[PDB]
Amino acid sequence: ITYNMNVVIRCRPMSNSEKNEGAKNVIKIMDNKMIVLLKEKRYCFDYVFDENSTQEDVYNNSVKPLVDAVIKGYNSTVFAYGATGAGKTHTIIGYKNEPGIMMMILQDLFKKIKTLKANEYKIKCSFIEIYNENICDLLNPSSEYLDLREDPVKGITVSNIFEVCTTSVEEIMELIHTGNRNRTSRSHGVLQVIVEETEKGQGLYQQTKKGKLCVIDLAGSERGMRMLEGANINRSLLALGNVINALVSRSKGTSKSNFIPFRDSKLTRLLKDSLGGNCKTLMIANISPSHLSYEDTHNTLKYANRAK
Amino acid sequence: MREIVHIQAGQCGNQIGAKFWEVISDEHGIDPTGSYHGDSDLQLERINVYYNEAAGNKYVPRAILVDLEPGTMDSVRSGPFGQIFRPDNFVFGQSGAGNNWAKGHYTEGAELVDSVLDVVRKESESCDCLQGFQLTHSLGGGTGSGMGTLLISKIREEYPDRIMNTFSVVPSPKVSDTVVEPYNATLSVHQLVENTDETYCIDNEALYDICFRTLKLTTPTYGDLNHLVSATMSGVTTCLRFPGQLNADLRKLAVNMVPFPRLHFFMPGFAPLTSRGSQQYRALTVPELTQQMFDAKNMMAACDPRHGRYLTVAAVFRGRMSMKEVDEQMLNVQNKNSSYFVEWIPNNVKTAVCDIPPRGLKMSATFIGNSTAIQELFKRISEQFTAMFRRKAFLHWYTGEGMDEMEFTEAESNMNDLVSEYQQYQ
Ligand SMILES: Nc1nc2c(ncn2[C@@H]2O[C@H](COP(=O)(O)CP(=O)(O)OP(=O)(O)O)[C@@H](O)[C@H]2O)c(=O)[nH]1
Ligand SMILES: Nc1nc2c(ncn2[C@@H]2O[C@H](COP(=O)(O)OP(=O)(O)OP(=O)(O)O)[C@@H](O)[C@H]2O)c(=O)[nH]1
Ligand SMILES: Nc1ncnc2c1ncn2[C@@H]1O[C@H](COP(=O)(O)OP(=O)(O)NP(=O)(O)O)[C@@H](O)[C@H]1O
Ligand SMILES: [Mg+2]
Ligand SMILES: [Mg+2]
Ligand SMILES: [Mg+2]
């Protein structure tokens, strides 16, 4: 019933610009599970990362269990979350010479795959851009934008999407960075892979498993082209986020027994398969320590308490 | 300022559009030639909302007429007000769609559509501040359902920030005119869900009931039925065309009546409606109008409002009226009929008043309700689709036009989801 959505907070370091403004530390960490926003409104989570937390620490204390669930045959999804300027792309993709959990994930995922492979794997990587509700194929951009299609037993496939059956960390890493070069953030960077495993004994009944691992560079809350992008982006951010609130009611097991509004957006409808599936989920809120961001840190965290 | 673009697609749609145009020209003092012969300066002040001004003191509807068959066009051109339309705005095919949504959406209507698109782009370029589009058609046939769907998809692609309004002729339960109606409706409804901002669900059965029971009319013709629809259409946009005391246009109405994106299917209504005999034995007053409008038997959709709850209702009043009286009456209806209104949206009623009444009447009213009872319409349709689809009945024709079974599966799923969502918010 529940989606087991753990909620962690990552505080990005104060920038030189914030220091030059003279902004002080609006975020005060009280515990690994609790922060206050300065006065001192409380927010409570499963884990909080401070300004010096590394990419490896984020992996180890927040998503490693999700990646593991996938290699073990489950679905899992990481939703980085917040207002524009929050810290999501850096946490997820980062830079090729300073990568995000995408790389930390590939390194751990593939060590586990190579070991387990002794069950043949097909690591079906895909990467899409959800922009104005259209889906860009970022691995094969010649197909431009795609739609979403329900399937026999109504999960969802991005129509005619290009997938790559990779074997290594570097293959997916380069594939993804290229995919980011093909992007517009004005869109939701939905990165996903099907960790498919078939009994090396192919002549035996192939009772395969299809684990699903997904991490999203959600377009942030924004306060004519850009106005529309903002509009569409913010609307989808409210739609997926309140589909999360519906999931909380479901997970709680309260009297609000209804159909969760995943159909409100293409973003959510696709995410549906993992949001309500046999899965583990994680939201990584991304916030700033600066007084300058208080509005942002205040709204991003308010949501995070509700999601949690 | 604030120009509306009118589109008519398929036979029924075209017919309704003709009626609409006739009424509106009369209202604005425009004759069958396009010349203004009215008295009031108020009739011309906002003439540009629906009419383009041509050379030599003439006015022409910002209307596009679409059909896969040419006969309908001819019929329109030969009918009353036929000559007012711009000849270049008639876009017709030669083949027809044969009650096949696939022919209208994928094949014939696809070949047709580019011309239509070109026309409508030009029409958009002409107007300075186009507020949006109004499409009149039916979801039970081929040409009317497919062509309209494709066109609305294209207009949401090129005009994603503009208001998209449809006036549809929903298939009734008992009076089933065709055999594949369930299929065509299902396919079109799905598309409407994603691409229209507001959809006025009009039903022939309900119209008949109105005509028979309320007007006491010996022999209704389609024209008579169409008249009612036309009146309703006129009502919604009265605020764009005239002054008033409280003014609400298409956008304002949508924002007040649509609390969740998908829930944009209205049950419209009109009042007053009396016979010739019962005209003398009545009070021309706001309380009476209010009484009429909220009655279940005055709804133009075949759904019982007493089977659900009103999420929101917009009332649009025309004529010289006291605001206080209007407010009292609307508060009274919500207090007395508490059980028919969702309790978690306080003041479920939005009011708008235009000083200029329709011709012949001193006071008039138009009703727009977002009722959870609309689920009944969807549910029946879904059921019928299931009944057909389980045995793959008539599927072959659709597949011969390039359509795949999976689309049907998708649409049905979508509709089911929609139904569920309505139920839960009840
Ligand atoms: N309320 C009205 N309903 C109508 C009218 N004419 C037809 N209809 C209804 O609409 C349905 C028939 O639709 P159409 O003739 O519009 C189908 P269309 O010409 O659009 O496509 P084809 O399949 O190519 O004929 C059916 O339910 C009729 O009973 C009308 O003047 N008023
Ligand atoms: N006292 C008084 N109140 C009015 C009058 N007209 C409208 N209202 C009130 O004003 C509110 C509605 O706001 P409006 O002023 O009509 O809306 P607006 O400022 O034009 O804003 P938009 O139309 O939404 O752009 C309601 O509370 C009405 O009761 C008036 O003549 N006198
Ligand atoms: N933990 C971090 N350490 C160092 N730099 C960071 C960190 N987090 C974010 N940044 C930087 O801040 C800029 C990134 O904003 P990110 O790209 O983090 O914003 P975003 O959340 O993707 N914004 P948006 O796309 O609008 O929702 C990047 O160039 C990062 O290098
Ligand atoms: Mg980003
Ligand atoms: Mg026809
Ligand atoms: Mg106003």
Author numbering:
A (entry chain K): 2 to 39, 55 to 134, 136 to 201, 212 to 250, 258 to 342
B (entry chain H): 1 to 44, 47 to 360, 369 to 436
Tell me what the authors wrote about this structure, in their words.
The microtubule-based motor kinesin-8B is required for development of the flagellated Plasmodium male gamete, and its absence completely blocks parasite transmission. To understand the molecular basis of kinesin-8B’s essential role, we characterised the in vitro properties of kinesin-8B motor domains from P. berghei and P. falciparum. Both motors drive ATP-dependent microtubule gliding, but also catalyse ATP-dependent microtubule depolymerisation. All the reconstructions show that Pbkinesin-8B-MD and Pfkinesin-8B-MD contact a single tubulin dimer in the MT lattice, with motor binding centred on the intradimer tubulin dimer interface. The interaction between Plasmodium kinesin-8Bs and α- and β-tubulin is centred on helix-α4.
Intriguingly however, P. berghei kinesin-8B exhibits a non-canonical structural response to ATP analogue binding such that neck linker docking is not induced. Surprisingly, the structure of MT-bound Pbkinesin-8B-MD in the presence of AMPPNP is overall similar to that of the NN state. While density corresponding to bound nucleotide is clearly present, the overall open configuration of the NBS is very similar to that in the motor’s NN conformation. Consistent with this, helix-α6 again abuts the C-terminal end of helix-α4 and no neck linker docking is observed. However, differences in EM density are visible between the 2 nucleotide states such that density corresponding to a number of loops around the motor domain—including loop 2, loop 9, loop 11 and the neck linker—are more flexible in the presence of bound AMPPNP and, as a consequence, were not included in the AMPPNP model (h dashed lines). Because this variation in density is not attributable to resolution differences, we conclude that it reflects small structural adjustments of the motor domain to the bound nucleotide, but these are not converted into larger conformational changes. As a result, overlay of the NN and AMPPNP models of Pbkinesin-8B-MD (aligned on helix-α4) shows only minor structural variations around the NBS, β1-lobe and in helix-α6. In both Plasmodium kinesin-8Bs NN reconstructions, there is an additional connection between α-tubulin and loop 2, which protrudes from the β1-lobe of the motor domain and appears to adopt a partially helical configuration. In the Pbkinesin-8B-MD-AMPPNP reconstruction, the density corresponding to loop 2 is less distinct due to the above described motor domain flexibility, although at more inclusive density thresholds, connectivity with the MT surface is also visible. A further striking difference between MT-bound Pbkinesin-8B-MD and HsKIF18A_MD is its structurally minimal response to AMPPNP binding. The minimal structural response of Pbkinesin-8B-MD is surprising given the neck linker dependence of MT gliding activity by this motor and its relatively conserved neck linker sequence.
